[PDB]
Amino acid sequence: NLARMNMFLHNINYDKFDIKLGNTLTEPHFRDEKPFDAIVSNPPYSVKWIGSDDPTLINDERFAPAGVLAPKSKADFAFVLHALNYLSAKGRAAIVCFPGIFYRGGAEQKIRQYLVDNNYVETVISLAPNLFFGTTIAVNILVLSKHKTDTNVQFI
Amino acid sequence: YQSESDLERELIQDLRNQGYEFISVKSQSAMLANVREQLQNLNGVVFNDSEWRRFTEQYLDNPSDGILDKTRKIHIDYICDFIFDDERLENIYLIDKKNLMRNKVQIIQQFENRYDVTILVNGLPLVQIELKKRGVAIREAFNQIHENSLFKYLQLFVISNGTDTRYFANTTKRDKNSFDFTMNWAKSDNTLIKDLKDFTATCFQKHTLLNVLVNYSVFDSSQTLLVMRPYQIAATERILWKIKSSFTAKNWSKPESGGYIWHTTGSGKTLTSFKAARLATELDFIDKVFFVVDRKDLDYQTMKEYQRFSPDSVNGSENTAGLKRNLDKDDNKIIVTTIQKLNNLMKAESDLPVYNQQVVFIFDECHRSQFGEAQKNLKKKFKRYYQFGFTGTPIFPENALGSETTASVFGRELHSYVITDAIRDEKVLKFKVDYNDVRPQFKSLETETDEKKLSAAENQQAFLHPMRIQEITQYILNNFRQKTHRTFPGSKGFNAMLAVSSVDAAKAYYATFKRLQEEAANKSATYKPLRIATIFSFAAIGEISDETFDTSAMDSSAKEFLDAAIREYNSHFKTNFSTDSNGFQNYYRDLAQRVKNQDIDLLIVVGMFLTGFDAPTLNTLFVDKNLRYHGLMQAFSRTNRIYDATKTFGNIVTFRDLERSTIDAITLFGDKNTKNVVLEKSYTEYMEGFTDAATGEAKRGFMTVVSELEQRFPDPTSIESEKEKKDFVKLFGEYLRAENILQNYDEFATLKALQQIDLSDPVAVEKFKAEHYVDDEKFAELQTIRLPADRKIQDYRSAYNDIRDWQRREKETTDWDDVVFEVDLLKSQEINLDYILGLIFEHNRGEMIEEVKRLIRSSLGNRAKEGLVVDFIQQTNLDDLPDKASIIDAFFTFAQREQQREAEALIKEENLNEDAAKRYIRTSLKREYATENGTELNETLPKLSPLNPQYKTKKQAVFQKIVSFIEKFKGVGGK
Amino acid sequence: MTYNNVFDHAYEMLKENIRYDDIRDTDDLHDAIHMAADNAVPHYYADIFSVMASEGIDLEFEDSGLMPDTKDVIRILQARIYEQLTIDLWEDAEDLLNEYLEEVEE
Amino acid sequence: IEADDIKDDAIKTKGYFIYPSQLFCNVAAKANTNDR
């Protein structure tokens, strides 16, 4: 509710500026509209969800080439595998993450393997502690693209 | 939005935005310098001038290399065991197949006029983009053409006009220079992408383009490049997903570690399964992949192009020596096996070393007899197995009939390719199934549905009656040349098959076929008896069993009657085929070769040629046999193959009633549209009257409406007053509503072609008979029916449409709320500015103003260009334009110029804010319509905001000006 | 946000590291405890103090080597959370070894 | 609705109010607001 009135206060029009209610993982829409030219995100931590798998989420369209799923308490990278389905050729993604990845278990090891196995990740930028509300650690900023240079430049 | 130079410029800008680095090289040797700069970055070597010229001329540019040699350098001969100055033996790559993203890519345009764009892959060109104009059709552009040596490395062409876009593999064969091997591109859901910009926004991902060129390019053992269909490419990486994803989750050897691909027939299962197998061999933990195909699923083609790949074992033999050779030896990680070798393995052995290894399967169109046997030992033996199945007719849980299903084996679905996609994309042909109730003597028996008298009345009063069969056969032998275009000399012709059920029945068939062959010379002497030939051994309506080729199934009624068929075959052919499961198998394969080039022109098979046989050389099937779902689909998939423009639909003449079975078996697959996309209604219903009792309304009965609209309103000049308007509109809406459904029928267009006859015109007799499946009875009864001429068809819809604009702004009577407008009914056969500008050059030797004035008032959606076209041709001279597309581009250039003028003119005359006006106009242009929503309409009104009275003027007044402006320039560019 | 809430996340991540890695060793799974229990601690201020105000956990260490001898009070609290969770996962691992490895025999 | 009326009234002629409701989609009245 407060999100749907947040942009309404800032002189924005009526037509398109929607927010849909539900899980972005299990209930996406619009699939059919469209590969986007820019996304932004901030996923919450501890957003656990049923796998891996009891549901049909093994065979979904956003997980076609990548690798094995994301477990429950480490559900951050499910948003970023959700990300690069909903992106065009042109634009870029800018997502945020926990810093503490070494390989994050035998599931996320091959997730990071897949993400750097192409030029999907363009840059990663670490941040400054605290600069938030009681974290006290910093966070990551991954900037992804389907867009070559190609070297995985790490401007942390 | 049409100038192809600017289309090329937008292509350049989009590819620069996606990451293609655009360079500019206008010399021959700097191309090689770029290649040297790319390959030294890729492989990490350093050439001097001597090593670079040596590597160029000795490995890259031996000048006598053919185009097949250029392609051979790509997929096999791409690693040179190369010698340096210090004479060390290193590997030299061209394209890194391990990590595809390593290869840097660039784009150029050629030298030297025409507008083409070439994609350099590590400096090497593989992809040429031709951009032909919008006046040029793409099939016409392909028939035009299809130095130096670097531009002979090309592997793929994409030709487009902006509206349509197709791609095809680089071929130099002249039969392969026919247009039918060019393909469109679709998304994952098999919805087409026809336009240019979305084709670039989908196909021109770097990963996608390199993946197609590397891991999906069919380079066979005959140097013939093929490119897989997009649903095949989508479904292959579903499999290569599912293997790794089930392996890491460690859920192997279970039905959820199964998974089925559902591709209809016409999916390249010789090719697709083989390519997925070869990609599955490259996985590290996977060691053994089983290519499980029936010998019914095999042909000569799996023995033809697989000579270096798998020779002299790809057939249903009994020996597991070719099995155990791959069960022991490495580097052949694919095991091409058959159900006979598999049954020998599952009955002779349960002690293989391969059980604790990785086991991968491929299945193909499986029935319930052999595949119902094999899984019972497959669950017994294997420890880590991966089973995947290709099918076109699934063994559903919906029609399971007591036994093992697709969900029981494979479970979850991986990828679908329905039949109506191939119907929708012309990979198959439509059908002709109306029931042949030519004999009511066996009326309830030729329409019998209960199981009882279909088999237990194996007698000459239900189904073995010879005098029934040969009068049926005389009906075939009258329509033998007729239904296969052969009564018109000039066509090549086609042949037919026969669906039979048993063996002694088939003896009574075939010997009496020979009796009518004798009576085709005795009683007729003009019907030339073509060599009827049967094939069947012994089996072994809901289960298609493969008739095995051993003498442990046949008798003298089966085998020795087939030997009579041998000695009547060798009475004409004199062949060298024996009677085992090899020589009779090769007899079957030579027979399939002779039917393939239409030597034998009548075939009689009990239960074969169904799951694996493919031939576009047959258009008609005669069926006297009951069938159910999978047999229905496979038998109907025998005439559906596209061949040329002539073969358009496949005839099925059913003698047992299976039309409701056809309805319910295609209702298994598609939509309520699809029951009448193809078939299933008789033509006389809508023409001469019927009644749907769902609401009990007037289901006319088209000629009644025809004669009423003829007599009551002969012309739009007869339509003056308002009730005279409504009495025409209320019936002409029902006219077009019937005509829309009639246009799906063949007989309606047959009648439209009979509206263009001449007297007596033996061309329009002879050419029209056996190229539209027409006799003289059609010449009588379709001349009894008449249609108004096409000038009347133009002025009927113009009289509809000017009344439709007369209902606009009125809003100012007879009631018009009961009169429903018909927007999708005038969607039939628009004039889309192409038919106008074709006639603009075709009108020679102006006085064509009345022609364009008539045609512009026919179509809604074009009439505000009425003030654009005529004012064009009064202003400009068509003598300066050389051809059609030049006058098209001149017209749209004039249109954009006057659009940009009158856009300023309409804003100057009404005192808007210029920036808000310029935003809203070109927002509505690319938006394709106009709206009321959004604050920017009040911000472009712009000065007052009510505070009524009254503010319809100027608000809805300027709005009505703007919507007419949008109708004036919809479908054109300009800013 | 109790101690049991954090213990459930550490419990489930322990079941992940035993399950999807398929390790059948005591010492390597205690290194997996070092992985999982350290990754299940909260990060907000009030979400740490709510567990500290809850039952189960106390203030004082047993090993003062977990303490950085400085102003890093939240590091001390996080180390106490880590120590209590590692003790409970000593007991939980000695349960789940013979509970789970007997279960995976198929 | 006012580019005159510091205070308002319920005379909005309710065949009209759909046209800002097709543009802003919130019409209480002229006199059901926080200023009133």
Swiss-Prot record, chain A:
Coiled coil: none annotated. It comes from the Bacteria. The subtype gamma methyltransferase (M) subunit of a type I restriction enzyme. In the presence of the R subunit the complex can also act as an endonuclease, binding to the same target sequence but cutting the DNA some distance from this site. Whether the DNA is cut or modified depends on the methylation state of the target sequence. When the target site is unmodified, the DNA is cut. The C-terminus is required for assembly of the restriction enzyme complex. The individual domains assume different positions in the enzyme, allowing the holoenzyme to regulate the methylase, endonuclease and translocation states. Belongs to the N(4)/N(6)-methyltransferase family. Type I restriction and modification enzymes are complex, multifunctional systems which require ATP, S-adenosyl methionine and Mg(2+) as cofactors and, in addition to their endonucleolytic and methylase activities, are potent DNA-dependent ATPases. The type I restriction/modification system is composed of three polypeptides R, M and S; the restriction enzyme has stoichiometry R(2)M(2)S(1) while the methyltransferase is M(2)S(1). There is an equilibrium between R(2)M(2)S(1) and R(1)M(2)S(1); the latter is methylation and translocation proficient but restriction deficient. (Microbial infection) Holoenenzyme interacts with Escherichia phage T7 protein Ocr; this interaction leads to the inhibition of the restriction activity, but may still allow methylation and translocation. This is Type I restriction enzyme EcoR124I/EcoR124II methylase subunit. It comes from Escherichia coli. The chain holds residues 261 to 416 of 520 of the full protein.
Swiss-Prot record, chain B:
Residues 250-395 form the Helicase ATP-binding domain. InterPro entries: Helicase_ATP-bd, HsdR_RecA-like_helicase_dom_2, P-loop_NTPase, Restrct_endonuc_type1_HsdR_N, Restrct_endonuc_typeI_HsdR, SWI2_SNF2, Type-I_R_enzyme_R_subunit, TypeI_RM_Rsu_C. Residues 682-810 are annotated as: Helicase domain. Pfam families: EcoR124_C (PF12008), HSDR_N (PF04313), SWI2_SNF2 (PF18766), T1R_D3-like (PF22679). A motif (DEAH box) lies at residues 364-367. It is an enzyme of class 3 (hydrolase). One of its GO terms (molecular function) is ATP binding. Keywords: ATP-binding, DNA-binding, Endonuclease, Hydrolase, Nuclease, Nucleotide-binding, Plasmid, Restriction system. Residues 426-652 are annotated as: Motor 2 domain. Residues 809-829 are annotated as: Helicase-CTD linker. Residues 206-425 are annotated as: Motor 1 domain. Residues 2-205 are annotated as: Nuclease domain. It comes from the Bacteria. CDD domains: DEXHc_RE_I_HsdR, HsdR_N, SF2_C_EcoR124I-like. Type I restriction and modification enzymes are complex, multifunctional systems which require ATP, S-adenosyl methionine and magnesium as cofactors and, in addition to their endonucleolytic and methylase activities, are potent DNA-dependent ATPases. A monomer in solution. The type I restriction/modification system is composed of three polypeptides R, M and S; the restriction enzyme has stoichiometry R(2)M(2)S(1) while the methyltransferase is M(2)S(1). There is an equilibrium between R(2)M(2)S(1) and R(1)M(2)S(1); the latter is methylation and translocation proficient but restriction deficient. The individual domains assume different positions in the enzyme, allowing the holoenzyme to regulate the methylase, endonuclease and translocation states. Deletion of the linkers between the domains prevents movement and thus restriction activity. This is Type I restriction enzyme EcoR124I/EcoR124II endonuclease subunit.
UniProtKB/Swiss-Prot annotation, chain C:
Gene3D superfamilies: DNA mimic ocr (1.20.120.780). One of its GO terms (biological process) is symbiont-mediated evasion of host restriction-modification system. It comes from the Viruses. It holds the Pfam family ocr. Keywords: Early protein, Host-virus interaction, Inhibition of host innate immune response by virus, Restriction-modification system evasion by virus, Viral immunoevasion. Prevents both degradation and modification of T7 DNA by the host restriction-modification complex. Structural mimic of the phosphate backbone of B-form DNA that binds to and completely occupies the DNA-binding sites of all known families of the complex type I DNA restriction enzymes. Thereby, inhibits the restriction endonuclease activity and protects the phage genome as it penetrates into host cytoplasm. Inhibits host transcription by binding to the bacterial RNAP and competing with sigma factors. Inhibits the host exclusion defense system BREX. Homodimer. Interacts with HsdM (AC P08957), the M subunit of host type I methyltransferase restriction enzyme M.EcoKI; 1 Ocr dimer binds to M.EcoKI. Interacts with HsdR (AC P08956), the R subunit of host type I bifunctional endonuclease and methyltransferase restriction enzyme R.EcoKI; 2 Ocr dimers binds to R.EcoKI. Interacts with host PglX/BrxX (AC P0DUF9); this interaction inhibits the enzymatic activity of PglX/BrxX through high-affinity binding. Forms a 2:2 tetrameric complex with phage T7 OCR. This is Protein Ocr. The lineage of its organism: Viruses, Duplodnaviria, Heunggongvirae, Uroviricota, Caudoviricetes.
